[PDB]
Amino acid sequence: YKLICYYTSWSQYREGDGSCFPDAIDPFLCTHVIYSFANISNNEIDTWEWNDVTLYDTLNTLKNRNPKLKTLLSVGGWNFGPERFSKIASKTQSRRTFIKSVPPFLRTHGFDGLDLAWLYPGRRDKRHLTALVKEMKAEFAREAQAGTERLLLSAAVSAGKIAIDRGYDIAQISRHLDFISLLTYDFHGAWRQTVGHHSPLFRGNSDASSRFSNADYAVSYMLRLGAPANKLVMGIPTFGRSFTLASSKTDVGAPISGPGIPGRFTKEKGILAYYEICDFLHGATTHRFRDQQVPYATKGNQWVAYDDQESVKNKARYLKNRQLAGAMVWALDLDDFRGTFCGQNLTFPLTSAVKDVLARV
Ligand SMILES: CC(=O)N[C@@H]1[C@@H](O)[C@H](O[C@H]2O[C@H](CO)[C@@H](O[C@@H]3O[C@H](CO)[C@@H](O[C@@H]4O[C@H](CO)[C@@H](O[C@@H]5O[C@H](CO)[C@@H](O)[C@H](O)[C@H]5NC(C)=O)[C@H](O)[C@H]4NC(C)=O)[C@H](O)[C@H]3NC(C)=O)[C@H](O)[C@H]2NC(C)=O)[C@@H](CO)O[C@H]1O
Ligand SMILES: *[C@@H]1O[C@H](CO)[C@@H](O[C@H]2O[C@H](CO)[C@@H](O)[C@H](O)[C@H]2NC(C)=O)[C@H](O)[C@H]1NC(C)=O
């Protein structure tokens, strides 16, 4: 089983304990660590933060402690305009120029592969997304001829039925991609004003519409479309999505006036790192949707939907039963990486639970 863990560029800037460097990563925890995110300029892969070349190095020296560890760089991300990806992928000339610029870059910085996080291609991109994956892979095969190990190629895909129908030719890209990471946790889409869990496992028996929104449907749908199980990786979040209530109602359906207050370290409305949620729980009331098998908490007018150790062990058990390739975690720097925020003195509590269940067979 594979354990793909994302580490983000900008977590170095958080204050105090919030700050996280490649340093803090247990080399034996995951099988693959993906650095986010690389940028694109003058049509070539390129760096993003001034000090990336350094952190690139830091991350990749973990391979000295664990020689089996594989690292990848990710291009794209949500703060990267899809129009930009779209503009590069549509013109064979600008597309070829980018592809050709990738291998040398990965090799200089010691990465073992590239990860595509185009979020998200639209109806008019489906065809180009395919041209890009296909041609890029071909470039990796051709490059392995130089006598070095073939570079890996992966992609982060939307887990929403409509997004999948609109911009992905799943059957096509799965034959060229090494693994596909299902973004099964952006379900309660930023849009509406009703409390809801962003990463439910199951349908949530007590609800008629938007049954398409849960890990289970997404996974079954991908297999129906043609993605083989041995390349599917299910995304497990390590953060919580918060809300500022607009009434005293706290159960399913309750109204929402907007996103929740920022976390002390995370400084971003609507989300909270797991280690922040641990602190938050003190004095909070905890509930758990039996149907979807995921927890949620409230305190004051703040409602938080999140994942704890057992909801995470659950998804992991599920993924094994459907015989998928492994799990994907977003993200290491949001988990309790110091191990000093969540009761127990364990480091990376959430990612380990996934790893424990995965190591059982
Ligand atoms: C599978 C997959 O691909 N993942 C999906 C993700 O894309 C989803 O969301 C996540 O991605 C977005 C980015 O795409 C991420 O956005 C980040 O937001 C933060 C926090 O609000 C930004 O952090 C700030 O970054 C700037 C610079 O980049 C920092 O400023 C710098 O300051 C130093 C001095 O401090 C200077 O030396 C630098 O020059 C300087 N830059 C400037 C401004 O001059 C700043 O310190 C920092 N933090 C602060 C103040 O809080 C960060 O840049 C954004 N990311 C990028 C790469 O642009 C978003 O936070 C993230 N969401 C979560 C919850 O992780 C993900 C969401 O669910 O799921 C996947 O589907
Ligand atoms: C990512 O690459 C982009 C595009 O090359 C960089 O974009 C900006 O840089 C120019 C400065 O000379 C601006 O004139 C442009 O408005 C802008 N390019 C755009 C929007 O296409 C950007 O600096 C890079 N980002 C990082 C973190 O390096």
UniProtKB/Swiss-Prot annotation:
Residues 302-316 are annotated as: Important for AKT1 activation and IL8 production. It holds the Pfam family Glyco_hydro_18. This is Chitinase-3-like protein 1. GO terms for biological process: activation of NF-kappaB-inducing kinase activity; apoptotic process; carbohydrate metabolic process; cellular response to tumor necrosis factor; chitin catabolic process; inflammatory response; lung development; positive regulation of angiogenesis. InterPro entries: Chitinase_II/V-like_cat, Chitinase_insertion_sf, Glyco_hydro18_cat, Glycoside_hydrolase_SF, Glycosyl_Hydrlase_18. It is found in: Secreted, Extracellular space; Cytoplasm; Cytoplasm, Perinuclear region; Endoplasmic reticulum. Monomer. It comes from Capra hircus. Glycans are attached at N39, N345. The keyword Plastid does not apply. One of its GO terms (molecular function) is chitin binding. Chitin binds at E49, W50, G76, G77, W78, N79, Y120, L183, T184, Y185, D186, R241, W330. Keywords: Antimicrobial, Apoptosis, Cytoplasm, Disulfide bond, Endoplasmic reticulum, Glycoprotein, Inflammatory response, Lectin, Secreted, Signal. One of its GO terms (cellular component) is cytoplasm. Disulfide bonds join C5-C30, C278-C342. Carbohydrate-binding lectin with a preference for chitin. Has no chitinase activity. May play a role in tissue remodeling and in the capacity of cells to respond to and cope with changes in their environment. Plays a role in T-helper cell type 2 (Th2) inflammatory response and IL-13-induced inflammation, regulating allergen sensitization, inflammatory cell apoptosis, dendritic cell accumulation and M2 macrophage differentiation. Facilitates invasion of pathogenic enteric bacteria into colonic mucosa and lymphoid organs. Belongs to the glycosyl hydrolase 18 family. The gene is CHI3L1. Residues 1-361 form the GH18 domain.
